[PDB]
Amino acid sequence: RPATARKSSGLSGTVRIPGDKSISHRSFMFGGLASGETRITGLLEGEDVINTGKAMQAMGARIRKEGDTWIIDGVGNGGLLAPEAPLDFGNAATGCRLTMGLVGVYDFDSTFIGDASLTKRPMGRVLNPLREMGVQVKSEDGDRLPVTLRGPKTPTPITYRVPMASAQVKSAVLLAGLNTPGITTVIEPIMTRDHTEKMLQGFGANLTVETDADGVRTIRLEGRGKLTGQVIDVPGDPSSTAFPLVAALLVPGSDVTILNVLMNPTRTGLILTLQEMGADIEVINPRLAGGEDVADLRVRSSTLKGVTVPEDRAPSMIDEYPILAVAAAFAEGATVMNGLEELRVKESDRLSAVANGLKLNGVDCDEGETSLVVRGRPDGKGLGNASGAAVATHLDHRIAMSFLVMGLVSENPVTVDDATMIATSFPEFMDLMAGLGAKIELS
């Protein structure tokens, strides 16, 4: 299902982006665990959230949705009730793993099952630390579902050095720490997404983060402490935010306000990069949501300037390299994006797709084994492709959307060989963008 974006006259509108999955998941989980009531609006009701909510309900949380608001009466930290049946996580690997972390330390049997897909996924990175806290683990093969957990009557807090920087493992251990007396500590070599830390604090947990000279982080959590209900308006998905954000910056005569933007630095490498590139992004109505920094962004057409993007920023914007590279195609000078680390543990996987799409669209860029270099053309002259040449998306929704955004600015249209994958990632993309005045013709 190819799609073509054509030069836009100027984007305008106020849009809200679908809630972030991670914050939605934690809001729902913490909402069910905390004492008191939590009200959530903007929830991304995806598999992880849904399945996690089902599990929280299975363990005593009272959940209901009224209007656009989910209302959760939590069981209180340490208040989880033994589930009467296995907790099926379908294909929600994240919801499954975090729930395991949360529940494994409870002194009741918990069985986790999932579909064929999730059942093949390794769980050991989460199961290992649970075992170290005293959890009895019964699992298949190389620690795969189905998994039965039974926490000890009293778990032991642990000081876990995440063998490998993982926000999820860190998250699983911290959640495990919640029902554990004493201080559970997670030490991660580099700061990874810290939504669990942020949201725990947002729910009243006694959690601190120490960072040493090397940036090594020591997250300490006082277990069995209180967690209390919160009013949470879930911030939007940063990666989805990226598109209208970049489109508004690039399409001249554009003035767009994006509501409820997550401003957590571990998720906003793109925004930070654009700001350095001189993006006219006005941060307004700053506030907190479940402990997360949130603001709305008033984005006006800007003249972006090339910058060098440090490899250490990549984690905070891993999925935004495609759209940043597109933004770079319209920025002054060159933009240098370093980090061959893992664009699939490669520096030519979909990294090549982006480079190729750019080239296909007249963009002067150089793809290396360590850095992608893009020399931009702010006025988009000569960019795009008048012959209708379609960018090979390689079933990558990020490439499809980034290049559709590109066509809103390039002198010549940009076509993507397929947009179907957009429905599976940011289905409201087409409507939101068209709503802003973007002209995207779908095959």
Summarize the structure.
The protein has 443 residues and is an alpha/beta fold. It has two domains: 229 residues, UDP-n-acetylglucosamine1-carboxyvinyl-transferase, Chain; 214 residues, UDP-n-acetylglucosamine1-carboxyvinyl-transferase, Chain, CATH 3.65.10.10. 30% of the residues lie in helices and 27% in strands.
Helix/strand layout:
Layout: E1 3-6, E2 12-16, H1 21-33, E3 37-41, H2 47-58, E4 62-66, E5 69-73, E6 87-88, H3 93-104, E7 109-113, H4 116-120, H5 124-132, E8 136-140, E9 144-150, E10 159-161, H6 167-177, E11 183-188, H7 195-202, E12 207-211, E13 217-222, E14 231-233, H8 238-250, E15 255-262, H9 269-276, E16 280-289, E17 292-300, E18 308-309, H10 321-328, E19 334-338, H11 351-360, E20 364-367, E21 371-375, E22 390-391, H12 397-407, E23 414-416, H13 420-423, H14 429-435, E24 439-442
Parallel strand pairs: 2-15, 3-14, 6-7, 10-11, 18-19, 22-23
Antiparallel strand pairs: 1-23, 1-24, 3-5, 4-5, 7-9, 8-9, 11-13, 12-13, 15-17, 16-17, 19-21, 20-21
Helix pairs in contact: 1-2, 1-7, 2-3, 3-6, 5-6, 8-12, 10-11, 10-12
